Design an enzyme around this catalytic site. Sequence first.
Site, short mmCIF file in Angstrom:
data_model
loop_
_atom_site.label_atom_id
_atom_site.label_comp_id
_atom_site.label_asym_id
_atom_site.label_seq_id
_atom_site.Cartn_x
_atom_site.Cartn_y
_atom_site.Cartn_z
N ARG A 62 0.81 -1.26 0.08
CA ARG A 62 0.12 0.00 0.05
C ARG A 62 0.73 1.19 -0.08
NH1 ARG A 62 -0.96 3.48 4.34
NH2 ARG A 62 -1.75 2.22 6.37
N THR A 91 -0.25 7.87 -2.17
CA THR A 91 -1.31 8.00 -3.25
C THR A 91 -2.46 7.22 -2.56
OG1 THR A 91 -0.68 5.80 -4.54
CG2 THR A 91 -0.04 8.00 -5.17
N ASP A 117 3.38 -0.20 14.70
CA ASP A 117 3.56 -1.01 13.51
C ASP A 117 3.43 -2.43 13.88
OD1 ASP A 117 4.70 -2.25 11.02
OD2 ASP A 117 5.18 -0.37 10.51
N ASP A 120 6.50 -4.68 12.22
CA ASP A 120 7.69 -4.47 12.89
C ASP A 120 7.77 -5.10 14.28
OD1 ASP A 120 8.38 -3.22 10.42
OD2 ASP A 120 8.46 -1.20 11.33
O1 LIG Z 1 -1.72 1.06 12.75
C1 LIG Z 1 -1.47 0.37 11.78
C2 LIG Z 1 -2.07 0.59 10.60
C3 LIG Z 1 -1.79 -0.10 9.57
N1 LIG Z 1 -0.68 -1.09 9.83
C4 LIG Z 1 -0.40 -1.94 8.65
O2 LIG Z 1 -0.77 -1.42 7.17
C5 LIG Z 1 -1.36 -2.53 6.66
C6 LIG Z 1 -3.13 -2.15 6.89
O3 LIG Z 1 -3.14 -0.98 5.94
P1 LIG Z 1 -4.34 -0.53 5.36
O4 LIG Z 1 -4.26 -1.00 3.90
O5 LIG Z 1 -5.76 -1.37 5.91
O6 LIG Z 1 -4.51 0.86 5.48
C7 LIG Z 1 -1.07 -3.87 7.48
O7 LIG Z 1 -0.23 -4.80 6.68
C8 LIG Z 1 -0.69 -3.39 8.57
O8 LIG Z 1 0.39 -4.31 9.25
C9 LIG Z 1 -0.18 -1.19 10.85
O9 LIG Z 1 0.88 -2.13 11.11
N2 LIG Z 1 -0.41 -0.62 11.96
#
Ligand SMILES: O=c1ccn([C@@H]2O[C@H](COP(=O)(O)O)[C@@H](O)[C@H]2O)c(=O)[nH]1
Lengths: 210, 209, 210, 210
Positions: free
Chosen positions: C105, C109, C201, C204
Amino acid sequence: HMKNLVVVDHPLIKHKLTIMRDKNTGPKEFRELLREITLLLAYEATRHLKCEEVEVETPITKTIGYRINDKDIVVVPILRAGLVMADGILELLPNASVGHIGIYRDPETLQAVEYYAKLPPLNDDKEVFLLDPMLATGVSSIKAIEILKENGAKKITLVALIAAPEGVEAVEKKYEDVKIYVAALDERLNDHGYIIPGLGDAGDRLFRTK
Amino acid sequence: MKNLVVVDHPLIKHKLTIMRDKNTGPKEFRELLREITLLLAYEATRHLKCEEVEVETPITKTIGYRINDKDIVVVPILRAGLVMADGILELLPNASVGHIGIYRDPETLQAVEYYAKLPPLNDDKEVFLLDPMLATGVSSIKAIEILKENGAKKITLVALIAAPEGVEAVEKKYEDVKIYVAALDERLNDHGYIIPGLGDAGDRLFRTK
Amino acid sequence: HMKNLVVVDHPLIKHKLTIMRDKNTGPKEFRELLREITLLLAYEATRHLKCEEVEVETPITKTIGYRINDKDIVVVPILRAGLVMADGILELLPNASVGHIGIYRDPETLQAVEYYAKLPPLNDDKEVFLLDPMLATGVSSIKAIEILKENGAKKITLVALIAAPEGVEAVEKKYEDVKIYVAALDERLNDHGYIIPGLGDAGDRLFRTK
Amino acid sequence: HMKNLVVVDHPLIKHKLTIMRDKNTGPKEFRELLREITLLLAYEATRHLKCEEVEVETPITKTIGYRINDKDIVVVPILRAGLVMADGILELLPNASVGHIGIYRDPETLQAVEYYAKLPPLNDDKEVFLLDPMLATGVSSIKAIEILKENGAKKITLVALIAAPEGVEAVEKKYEDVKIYVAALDERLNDHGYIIPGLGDAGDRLFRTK
Ligand SMILES: O=c1ccn([C@@H]2O[C@H](COP(=O)(O)O)[C@@H](O)[C@H]2O)c(=O)[nH]1
Ligand SMILES: O=c1ccn([C@@H]2O[C@H](COP(=O)(O)O)[C@@H](O)[C@H]2O)c(=O)[nH]1
Ligand SMILES: O=c1ccn([C@@H]2O[C@H](COP(=O)(O)O)[C@@H](O)[C@H]2O)c(=O)[nH]1
Ligand SMILES: O=c1ccn([C@@H]2O[C@H](COP(=O)(O)O)[C@@H](O)[C@H]2O)c(=O)[nH]1
């Protein structure tokens, strides 16, 4: 011939590997066995790790014990099939950092295609364990090693289930310092790059993909 | 110590040192005991016999190997041997399992059985007897006695820490029993605890006093 | 306002999730807890699965018991962090087929693109469980559902740890039949697309990468 | 019309239980299923546990979370078969104290014989989970409850796999405050005190004893 290859000789590995080889063995069992064999291969593969003496106080008295630098271990599955091996080894090294390297081998071309690499910080101190069950032509593991080195890795140990001679030779030609631990060395590759007698397609057998 | 194998592996030493540490709580202590047992299992099962057998792989027929899997017997000594058994059963999932309960008297140094429930035993059966702390040896010697009474022949003792006196006592009585351990410590204290050891293993696994 | 959302309410989940949230919780414990929470969320997420009656003979007598079409369950982690959830769910569904999907992602964008997808055979009969811990904007899980549907998936259940309203809403706008099971609904997203208060995260913190 | 009985209704429990009942199911698989069912029964059996609100600081911000008194949970298998159940529940409650109660039922007299009891400290605050797969006449679990109450236990929950009505009734008659969670309520006992249709001898089928 093979300076850097260790074929682990243990009756339980033989036992379990033979079940994996058996074409009737389904994915639930195939995964269990892969995890279990990795736990045994781990014994040999980690025997080289360095201990520092450290004081410990037991409930009875103080004494001198031992410690490995635990956060300095890096476990790296090659996806997909290395995931299951990584689960096994992380039962023994639960405080390791984990990388993931997505490579598949193009069935027709027999070249490695990289689609993902996410790694924890790497340097000269880091002990890396790279895991992929089938070491056939070697192109996948060589590519993964290339990516590791590129990112600062020095000490790298490869853990596989089955290798073919030409794969082991390929890795030695390119990376003479990489030790390889396996449960078996098979005979050769077929025309489609599969290990003979091997056990078929490991990823597919683990996850029931076609 | 003719029958003693002290397994020398850096991961065992690492993990054993955390177990020793008085600050290590029950959850971790149990994890570590199971993990160490998986590594001690490597060495303790190296001797198992293979038969050649035919196998068909998806590619071709070949010759593979097999162990008589139901002919393995795993026998925890209650309580603390329970967690070891959990470890080894990860590697030997098709084993039969026996349970033995022995009370050791601190004052008289005598042992008595309070429970024993065993699967069928015979000459063919490979028995693994599991107790973390091999201190005076009287508990494991009583359990071996019970095993042999019920038809066991080949018995392997797996422990975490032994004291010399406990190893000697087993070898005096049962000269064919091989003993695999993570460590051989110095001696016992006036209460029969291993020094430096790790305290009371059962209590530290389950948080009992 | 959220038709397809199930926030699973259980004191153990709340307890364990609070530990994950805590910034001091290291990777070993964070992984453990993720797997353990996934096991509890599984209870609710699989409650809908259909049983067939089947005869069984017990050692005492014959009776009528129950059975699910076991090989017709499909578990799909979104790489990386979904991998730990998948391990959890596979403890309860060990005969499931397993697919793997990798989505990038783009933070600038807000667009999502596939970089890997390897799926078992899919059809109308298959019950798919799609796993990703953090459902933030929703674009990742929406792209994965897109890929699943493209390959023949019909019944799809999303299991996540924490979701943000906007993510839930985005999934419901696109794919109105996808049910979503979570341990918590948080408040919103920050400027960088993180769930507040969330837990940082997830990848991580699971693997100790930066 | 058994006031304290909760028969947990879940399609995965029914699926798994049916495989346990099946007389061809060997000890390895029987053990895995018992541990897996216990995980699911745990969901319902621990739903009542009490949460305290606590502050947590996530990597993003401070927030309010939840906490259970973790050391105040006590897990007590009845040996032998209860051991496998304890292993399952401890996956969810890993910081619980563990007691052991050794009771067998005399096959001929159908009376409970106690050979061991080793308990962690108990008081009014402690939540005790008592585990034994087969609740048939009730004598075993009643004796174990007796021992627990004798040692200071107040809040006690019984988790079993299958119960017979007479066992449930016997527990209710003596200990009206003990809740019982099970996977199934079967029909009755045969002449030797086995549950019909049940699944045979649980201890023997777990451990391959005769
Ligand atoms: O607070 C958050 C928000 C997103 N993500 C990471 O971003 C992705 C989800 O993003 P989304 O496409 O739902 O925005 C997942 O791979 C996730 O691990 C996190 O680790 N913590
Ligand atoms: O008999 C074989 C040979 C190769 N591979 C797969 O191909 C890759 C290794 O081949 P190579 O790159 O070592 O040639 C891995 O993805 C491995 O799973 C198998 O599954 N079975
Ligand atoms: O340092 C020790 C010594 C003995 N024991 C306990 O005593 C028994 C071994 O006693 P012995 O019969 O070998 O003396 C085992 O049940 C073990 O848990 C310990 O926990 N720690
Ligand atoms: O069908 C049955 C009935 C009873 N039991 C065993 O008997 C005891 C429970 O019987 P009761 O004390 O509830 O009568 C437990 O040890 C349980 O394992 C079985 O194994 N199977």
